[PDB]
Amino acid sequence: MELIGDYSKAFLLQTVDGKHQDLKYISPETMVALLTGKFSNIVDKFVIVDCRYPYEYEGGHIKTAVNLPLERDAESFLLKSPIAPKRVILIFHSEFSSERGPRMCRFIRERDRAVNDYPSLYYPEMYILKGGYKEFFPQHPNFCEPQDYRPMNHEAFKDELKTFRLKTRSW
Ligand SMILES: [Cl-]
Ligand SMILES: [Cl-]
Structure with missing residues (x-):
C-alpha cells in the first residue's frame, strides 16, 4: 500500500473497500x-x-x-x-x-496541496468512515449524542435542507 500524502510513512489504520477507489475507508470498529x-x-x-x-x-x-x-x-x-x-x-x-x-475529503487535500510546497501537507493522512453515520449509529449508539439518527431527507426538515443548500458554494 502507498504511503500517506506527504510520503513520510505508511497509513496507520486498517482499511476497507469503498466506492471512491482512490480514497481510504475505515470501519465503525476502527473509528471506535x-x-x-x-x-x-x-x-x-x-x-x-x-x-x-x-x-x-x-x-x-x-x-x-x-x-x-x-x-x-x-x-x-x-x-x-x-x-x-x-x-x-x-x-x-x-x-x-x-x-x-468524500467531496470534503478531496477538497481539503486540494487546499492542503495549494498552501504547501510539494509534497508537504498539514493533513497527510485522511480517511472516510465507511457507511457514514447511517452505519455507525446502529453499531455504536453510545458513541453518539444524542442517541438518534436524523436522515437528510427527514420529512420534517424539508425546509431546513433547502435553507442550508442556498448557503453552499455550488450545487
Ligand atoms: Cl462506499
Ligand atoms: Cl460549500
Missing part, C-alpha cells in the same frame, strides 16, 4: 478504536469531520465530531491555523459517506 485510545501512543490528535447539514448533526452525531458542511468553514477550521501534533489524522463522513464526506 481511535475514540477509545487504541492508537494514543502514536496518534496525537484526530478530527472527525461530520459533513452533513446542521439539522442532521443536531439529530445525532458521533461524540467529539465537528460539523463542517460548508467548504469555507471546513477550510477555516482546519487550515487557517493547522492542528499540529506523532500523527494527526482526519476522518470525514456524511450520512452514507457516499457524496458529501
